[model samples]
Target chain A: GLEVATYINQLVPTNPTGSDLKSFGDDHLRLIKSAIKNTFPNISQAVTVTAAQLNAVADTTQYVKPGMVIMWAGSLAQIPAGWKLCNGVGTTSNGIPVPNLIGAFPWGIDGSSQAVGTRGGSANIVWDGFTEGTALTLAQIPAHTHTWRSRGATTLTGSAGDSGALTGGSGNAANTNLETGPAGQGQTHNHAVKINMPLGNIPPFCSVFFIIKN
Target chain B: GLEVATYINQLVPTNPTGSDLKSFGDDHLRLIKSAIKNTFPNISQAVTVTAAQLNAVADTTQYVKPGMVIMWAGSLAQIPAGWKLCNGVGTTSNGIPVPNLIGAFPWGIDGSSQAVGTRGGSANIVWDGFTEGTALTLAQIPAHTHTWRSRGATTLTGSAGDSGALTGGSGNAANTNLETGPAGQGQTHNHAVKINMPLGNIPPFCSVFFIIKN
Candidate 1:
């Protein structure tokens, strides 16, 4: 049976100074023990009942419980270049077909501030995996393998060498012979290599690459 | 132990719409019962031992309880009038010193605005306990017991019979003997009463009634 008014005593500081001594001594501990004994006699009893003995008279039953779980996901872009390109498909670089093309190469070139004579003087390249419809001669290949032709030689005088080059080519020469086998039969070559590079050096002349989960 | 989950069956809507419906009756009931057992093990055990035992301990001391007491008092003015009065010694009523007397009485009066004269009158009377003062005469008294005496006879004149009548005198003459009781014997007789009689044939008068308590 529990005592109606018996309560546990908790020792607390009534007043404290910057440097003062206070402690719960044996007397206080005894008082607490006495309070517990008076409040809950069953808890203070000195007896041990084995599980088997209690189970002999008590019923064993099955019970159930409840819980919950949650799931979520997110996505972000990583353009090795200084800034990410517009993520729309069909976007292109120079005259080359871009890998993740958004709309078209130099899609809005007519609205550009470039003078008519200088419109195709230099070609901007992109590495998004697109190609210029025209074939490239061997001399136009860039120093590295992943590179591709951007804008080919136009009818302009000085703009002939302005055809784009990539990493695999040595100079601004077209790769016509490379496209043809040593036997003069049309030979096939690896179109482009995928590599992570900064957007500042990534040519707008060709295709662009997008990273995605395999 | 019986598995309650076995008794649960999913109910599908005939015209299913929106999200899928899931049945959680067994889970919800199990959670509720577990919570009850955790909070009140004694009652839970009693139910298992004997269903009737649960009711025996329904009002046991193990549960929280509350009680309250209401107190009230009556309004001040709600108390019947005259039930209590000021009990002070040496208090006077219209200047008469009576034992246990408590203070002045309230008086009311009314007059017309078109009266020819001041339309109001007052008298100064003194209490002598046994005899009236020289300034007062029986003629000053109104038809009842109170009076209004002017400072002098020539102060204002009206109908001769308009003045208060003096009893215990001949020919209606103004006499101190008729106005005051016999002196020296100190009989309780000369009591002063203030009255306000407005000018008119039947003018309104204000009077105050004071009595002494034993």
Candidate 2:
């Protein structure tokens, strides 16, 4: 059997002065920070801070949380069947399974489950946001954030009958395991020194966690 | 005597997202950053690291320095002698000393210095990068960066002969007074990183410093 290996590549760009490229760097940082905080909020409550160390206590580990939805139709084949679909909901005018287009799939199966489906024979995985529900109408879909994911996989020598069966799963229970923290609040701050006076400048931080299944 | 104040206003409207207006913000920011660095490398060095922070620092400063230039005009009656006419230099061209121009005045107690006789009335103080005898054609003069000082006292004011002098002197030579330090290197890493990456996905940052003279 061909060996299966997966790796996560994180691209972080530094902000530069007078450079025309600063906005992209800022946006990238903002997204990373938001993703981390949104995925984890408890990490901030158990820490102390100083003017020179506000970001010191911030933990990068909080960025990946279990309930955080990461959708990718391209990876549907790669993901096992136990993972649930948490995105698209509702019916189409013609009565087809309206895809959960723009939303995230807040559902997943236990890591103890067996190997799921393999990814389609594509190099990229298109991802939107984490969402709830099984079927999503075309009209209900909103804007596209353009966030995507990609992972290396073995080639599909031939169509296997077990492929779809491996990835088949339903949405997880609503509200359970979902992050309950404030929608945009990522870090905790004391108001005594106007610590966060200009609170709205940066986007909210978020985090999510997931387990790698074999 | 009649008292009058002048105010210039420019209102820029915002366009919807995905429209030209949205893109203009990013473009304008890039232009300003480029212009500042290109026009005044020395000043650019001091303020390029963190534009917002540098802007705040500049706001707290009392006067502009060498890399900085200010503009204004004065009555020919107030022109002092020995101040050699330096036009089309550095960032100043619009304020060139024109022969017999309505507001240009001859320097000194006697009009002997006047190359074209005693036609002194009012003169505009133009500060530019071009030093004495720089080859600046008329076309290049208009687009130069110049500032406006107090308009020469109107002829009708009380004590009409006592025209106010152009109050501020050039700060170019004084820029040498800047304290050298590690602060200059703060933005180097960020700049290098940006150069190695793609710029289209980024937003730009800029800082503008101008003098408001009465």
Candidate 3:
């Protein structure tokens, strides 16, 4: 019966002990295990998260009370107070970061400086491990073909130069390296590589949040 | 009391001034000083900071205009409109990158590449410097010794070889070179390396944002 509530608590490390029938139990086990297997349920621990659909969810214009945590599944056309979560991440329906086209890390003004009005995650790099190139993996790539060629040219008299099959010579006396291999036909095939290096993941990490203080 | 609005403003680098009680004086300063301590007041601001919560007191949204600023806790569920804050790092609750099975980067998505339509803060590399691989300082691993073995049958009868603890003998001395020694057996011991190059990180960071065209 405790759907969203327990679900939210389930996502956190400690749901804290109490009479929360829909939260983590005192035994430190699951208290309310509902049918939430595939994706994470949208959850919040605020006093009231009604019409939380965010769509038409009018800002009450009233300030939020302390300790109310709202977890949103959408974007903030507006901003929340700055002291909420630590470093949170937005995710896709599948829960990976990309809708990035819509969020921001509330650092102080970053660019020219704070007075300049700008900021960014201080994680700096020389672009060493970073990559910009794009290419699908063997499995993900659509069906395609590749043309092949002989290593090089051939040096045979007549029929002896018909590709590697070669139809020539007396018993095979080593005359230099190449007895004769022709222009060679092309061949094609698929390439299978192990692209699943890293493993899968779960969302709603760390102390990240977005809230307004007024 | 003016609860959190004042605290939230107090945290911001520049809380737009209006006017009021708290002074540093006026309401603006008091408002800004309402909820902030060091970091932004987890307060939301802007065109649409869905779910505002200024510690049971203030209304920051009303101040949001066109260029008004907001500071979201770091999480990339949606893309930042592109304008945001700065210099941030969100260590875990325990202040470590592990518990990975436990938390997100205040981000919405994080796992693999950003184009599989998938995205994550690809920033990685074992902080080989931050740890010394778990061990005490020097004076830890005490002195030790080892035994030797022959690769094949021994041939020396006396003083001919150099140091296999010395070779030939009695029928005594003569001509012969020790040449050199073989690769000695590698000693076995834990390398108490000073992997503590880079230190730990600070907590709670920034966010990103975007806007709709009119």
Model 2 misplaced regions, further than 4 Å: A1-214, B1-29, B44-214
- Writing each residue's lDDT as its tens digit, candidate 3 over A3-109 gives 23332222332223233443323233232233122122333334243322332334432322222223444445444543233222333233333212113333232
* Candidate 3 docking classification: incorrect
* Tens-digit lDDT track of model 1 for B1-214: 1122111121111212223232433343354344333433443122233424333344333221111001113443443332222232342222222221122211111112211111122222222212113243433222221122211221111122332111122233221321222112111223222222221121223332222221
The regions of model 3 sitting more than 4 angstroms off are: A1-105, A113-214, B1-184, B197-214
TM-score of each: 0.11, 0.11, 0.18
Q: Report per-candidate TM-score of chain A alone.
A: 0.14, 0.14, 0.17
Lowest lDDT 10-mer window, candidate 1 chain B?
Answer: B63-72
Place model 2 in a CAPRI quality band: incorrect
DockQ of each model vs. true complex: 0.00, 0.00, 0.03
Q: What local distance difference test score does each model get?
A: 0.25, 0.24, 0.28
Candidate 3's displacement at residue A189, Å, is 55
lDDT of 2 by residue, A1-214 (tens): 1111111112111212334454464453344445334333334332222223323224333222222223334444466443434333433222222223121111111112311111111112232222122232332222211111111221212222211111212333122221211111112111111011111121122233221211
